[PDB]
Design a protein around this nucleic acid. Structure first.
Ligand SMILES: Cc1ccnc2c1NC(=O)c1cccnc1N2C1CC1
Lengths: 410, 543
RNA sequence: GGCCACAAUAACUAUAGGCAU
DNA sequence: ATGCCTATAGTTATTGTGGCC
């Protein structure tokens, strides 16, 4: 066992418990009763002031209710243990592959026990209907799911068991993050399923126990300008305003020649022909949009920021950036056509899509900017949440200028 | 060796120690009576005599205010107060009052030395007899926390033996309710009394049991219904300044049961800040909604208990400007709980958007009390609902809602055109104002040749751009094309303003309903666009 | 006077736009 | 760059109702 010490000056997490539905409350008790008998969680008295938020999520593969505990408040204080004391190495050749398979390894953490002094900080309260019961309390005796300090201690044992796997396959690069395992293979799709099955069979030999992503298909889609045979005043006025907002992002684009076409007061119905200078500049601006802009670099010291915008009619776009008006990775997700789609579900699946891509390329949880209320989001996010890792999100205003620009992206 | 029910270890804060305050001056008249109290508690096993080994001192009033600051933080006793509307209907309800509650549950040996108090001397400043609390003291922060946790362990096997009965604990009082007959219910309480007697808890007999009408949190409780206590208000003259706010608080407490409660006009009088005795006179608009509120208070009404088999139904009504009231009910006419949404931060919130914000308030409240999402009934059409949110930036989702028409129907005023109108007159909108002396100009230049320039006194830059749109729509035909340069003016026309603010915008809104088609476009300011530069030179001629 | 639950009212920070120097 | 305006998010301080020490 290893003693865990907190950051000096800072006290333990104290967050108010968010209420859950009647179906979710009874689902949490069933899991907590089974874990108590095995030796995973134990009851504590009212002397404990530390509280941890707890939610309920549904599974697709195991079709059962799973317990989700948010450690976002604790992770800000326990960042010294998982980075300074015991850091996780990240390879550069992880983002460049053919197929990435995601496997859950969160069940393996229930074997290694937690420190005696740290047990009191992992206490959580279960919400009740109309506050009939005072609140049943449980503390983690082993490594909890969703905590960044769990893989740091398990790292010494994880490297030993993956040692014969890494020796057999030198070209295949493996990476561990939180509770999800990411394996990148350069083999064929028919051979990719065989390699994962051999790795999964090795886990059963130790003791503890289709979803696929394409890292090569995350190519940056260029923003193309609408092609029109006859340009009207109304079409120009919208074109100048959109490209002027993007002038701070792209220095190459100039709106000097476009404004000189209009002389004096004119109606929008009137058709204005483009000159030789106007046709040359507009065609040159498309080349700057296709070619990646100079000045894009990754910096691990600065925090990653992500902003998702609503477009309408089942269209969503996101921008990943470290500095304002300086994009690093751009992409868009339309609609999950097949069964059922709504305003929350299309946004919940969007956040999970960026988070998974953020781990493979970089390896950090970004700040998600959502066009939704705090009271609305913190109630319906649990219904479609599947991933055990919970990123930090903030709620801000969505400008009309950013909405009308990224709609032309192919 | 003396204390039962296994003591829970309690420690102080590492930052500072316990109290060190000296004893208060002598009274003599009150000390003599306290001697008999301390002797009686010593024989039972509550306090014990100690020597000069204890340095800690506690003043006798006994105040524990200094001790609570030194004591560590405990987890809250109650998470949200239970509402009578969300409770289950029971056939027979019996309450049990615990005698010697904190006297039974003891304190840990390590913490016993910190709760030591000194009795005031008789004469000549004598040391007297020192005493320390062995059990839970009266007025301690951790007293309601440990007692509730200890009672849960006592009633832990009792709940498993009888799943049909529902028992609730509140500080000292315990509520027992079941759907069983009066004969079977009386036997269960007698068995419950013997379970508590084993630890050392005093319970009243059958003759000392309280009647079905209960008084809890200001609510009158009944086995089949529930009602609020009648509020008596003075009906003669409006007194002082704070009593006006007291009437709002009385209406706030009445909002949970009475559906017809208006508070918007009363809050308008409380706009005056920094006042001890202001004395606000009554006005026509403020007393207008106050008269109808008193009429509903005259008739007594009762609420209904929650039933798990039936689904919850909610309906939204509009009673005033920027105010929404809702009622939750399972059966018609019989209401469970009523609510309100009256807060306006200042700017426009939109009637369709604020309605959705009101629904979210019900949804979140339904999770805490009921535990399930209710079926909503909105006064808005399905066609209007789909048009608003698809063009708006913010996303929201309502799972189950049905279309039911109500007498106060809410309808959309106007919608902006996506495509420009052919053969219509083009209007260019641009305005400028100065910070000094507060002066601004508004004008518009058309393709025909007509123009009008006016001067305004005491105005900001945001208002001068707003005034130019009003003048452009005033001297125009039916189909109007508006080209604006400001981003601020673009957001107001796209949304629907309906509040105390935006009085100047209300003149524009009224005109927009009269016109058939109105187009709006945005252009960048100060660049060199034909039509925008001509208006810019006129407004900045004197500024 | 502090603590707990819920409400109404005033102030302060991030984003977007604007004015003035 | 700072001071001064508006809007979209959030936060706090104040008062009130119901209780408690
Ligand atoms: C004060 C109180 C606290 C907690 N629950 C209840 C009540 N009491 C009610 O009076 C009560 C009355 C009638 C039916 N259920 C009730 N109830 C579920 C047990 C009723």
């Amino acid at each position: 066992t290893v003693p865990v010490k907190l950051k000096p000056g800072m006290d333990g997490p104290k967050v108010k418990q968010w209420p859950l539905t009647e179906e979710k409350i009874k689902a949490l008790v069933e899991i907590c009763t089974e874990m108590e008998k095995e030796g995973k969680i134990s009851k504590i008295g009212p002397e404990n002031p530390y509280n941890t938020p707890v939610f309920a999520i549904k599974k697709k593969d195991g079709t059962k209710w799973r317990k989700l505990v948010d450690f976002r408040e604790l992770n800000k204080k326990t960042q010294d243990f998982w980075e300074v004391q015991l850091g996780i190495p990240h390879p550069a050749g992880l983002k460049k592959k053919k197929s990435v398979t995601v496997l859950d390894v969160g069940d393996a953490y229930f074997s290694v026990p937690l420190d005696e002094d740290f047990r009191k900080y992992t206490a959580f309260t279960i919400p009740s209907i109309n506050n009939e019961t005072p609140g049943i309390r449980y503390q983690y005796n082993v490594l909890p799911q969703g905590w960044k300090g769990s893989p740091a201690i398990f790292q010494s044992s994880m490297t030993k068991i993956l040692e014969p796997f890494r020796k057999q396959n030198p070209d295949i690069v493996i990476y561990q993050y939180m509770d999800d395992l990411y394996v990148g293979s350069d083999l064929e799709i028919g051979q990719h399923r065989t390699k994962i099955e051999e790795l999964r069979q090795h886990l059963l030999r130790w003791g503890l126990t289709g979803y696929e992503l394409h890292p090569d298909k995350w190519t940056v889609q260029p923003i193309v300008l609408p092609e029109k045979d006859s340009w009207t005043v109304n079409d120009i006025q919208k074109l100048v305003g959109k490209l002027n907002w993007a002038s701070q992002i792209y220095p190459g684009i100039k709106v000097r020649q476009l404004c000189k076409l209009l002389r004096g007061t004119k109606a929008l119905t009137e058709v204005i022909p483009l000159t030789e200078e106007a046709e040359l500049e507009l065609a040159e601006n498309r080349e700057i949009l296709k070619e990646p802009v100079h000045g894009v670099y990754y910096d691990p010291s600065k925090d990653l920021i992500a902003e998702i915008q609503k477009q309408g009619q089942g269209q969503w776009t996101y921008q990943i950036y470290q500095e304002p008006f300086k994009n690093l990775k751009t992409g868009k997700y339309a609609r999950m056509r097949g069964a059922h789609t709504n305003d929350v579900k299309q946004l919940t699946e969007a956040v999970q899509k960026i988070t998974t891509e953020s781990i493979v390329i970089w390896g950090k949880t970004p700040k998600f900017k959502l066009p939704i209320q705090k009271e609305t989001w913190e109630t319906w996010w649990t219904e479609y949440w599947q991933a055990t890792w919970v990123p930090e999100w903030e709620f801000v205003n969505t400008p009309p200028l950013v909405k009308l620009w990224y709609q032309l992206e192919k | 060796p003396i204390s039962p029910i296994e003591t829970v270890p309690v420690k102080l804060k590492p930052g500072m120690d316990g109290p060190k305050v000296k004893q208060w001056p002598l009274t003599e008249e009150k000390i003599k009576a306290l001697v008999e109290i301390c002797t009686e508690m010593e024989k039972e096993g509550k306090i014990s005599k100690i020597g000069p080994e204890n340095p800690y001192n506690t003043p006798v009033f006994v105040d524990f205010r200094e001790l609570n600051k030194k004591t560590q933080d405990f987890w809250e006793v109650q998470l949200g107060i239970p509402h009578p509307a969300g409770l289950k209907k029971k056939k027979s309800v019996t309450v049990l009052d615990v005698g010697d509650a904190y006297f039974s549950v003891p304190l840990d040996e390590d913490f016993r030395k910190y709760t030591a108090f000194t009795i005031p001397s008789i004469n000549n400043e004598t040391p007297g007899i020192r005493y320390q609390y062995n059990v839970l003291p009266q007025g301690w922060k951790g007293s309601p926390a440990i007692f509730q946790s200890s009672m849960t362990k006592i009633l832990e096997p009792f709940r498993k033996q009888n799943p049909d009965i529902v028992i609730y604990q509140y500080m000292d009082d315990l509520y027992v309710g079941s759907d069983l007959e009066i004969g079977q219910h009386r036997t269960k309480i007698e068995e419950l009394r013997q379970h508590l007697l084993r630890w050392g808890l005093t319970t009243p007999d059958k003759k000392h049991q309280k009647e079905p009408p209960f008084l809890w949190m200001g609510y009158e409780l009944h086995p089949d219904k529930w009602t609020v206590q009648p509020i008596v208000l003075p009906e003669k003259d409006s007194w002082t300044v704070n009593d006006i706010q007291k009437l709002v608080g009385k209406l706030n407490w009445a909002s949970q049961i009475y559906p017809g409660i208006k508070v918007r006009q009363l809050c308008k009088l409380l706009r005056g800040t920094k006042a001890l005795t202001e004395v606000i006179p009554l006005t026509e608009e403020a007393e207008l909604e106050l008269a109808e509120n008193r009429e509903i208070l005259k008739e007594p009404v009762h609420g209904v208990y929650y039933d798990p088999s039936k689904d919850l139904i909610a309906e939204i009504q509009k009673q005033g400007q920027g105010q929404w009231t809702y009622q939750i009910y399972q059966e018609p006419f019989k209401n469970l709980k009523t609510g309100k949404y009256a807060r306006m931060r200042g700017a426009h919130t939109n009637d369709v958007k604020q309605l959705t914000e009101a629904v979210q308030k019900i949804t979140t409240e339904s999770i805490v009390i009921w535990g399930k999402t209710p079926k909503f009934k909105l006064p808005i059409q399905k066609e209007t609902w789909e048009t608003w949110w698809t063009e708006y930036w913010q996303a929201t989702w309502v799972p189950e809602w049905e279309f039911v028409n109500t007498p106060p129907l809410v309808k959309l005023w106007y919608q902006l055109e996506k495509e420009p109108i052919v053969g219509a007159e083009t209007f260019y909108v641009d305005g400028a104002a100065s910070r000094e002396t507060k002066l601004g100009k508004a004008g518009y230049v058309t393709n025909k040749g007509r123009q009008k320039v006016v001067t305004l006194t005491d105005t900001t830059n945001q208002k001068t751009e707003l005034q130019a749109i009003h003048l452009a729509l005033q001297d125009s035909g039916l189909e109007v094309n508006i080209v604006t340069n400001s981003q601020y003016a673009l957001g107001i026309i796209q949304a629907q303003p309906d509040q105390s603010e935006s009085e100047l915008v209300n003149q524009i809104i009224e005109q927009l309903i009269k016109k058939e088609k109105v187009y709006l476009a945005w252009v960048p300011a100060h660049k060199g666009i034909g039509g925008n530069e001509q208006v810019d030179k006129l407004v900045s001629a004197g500024i």
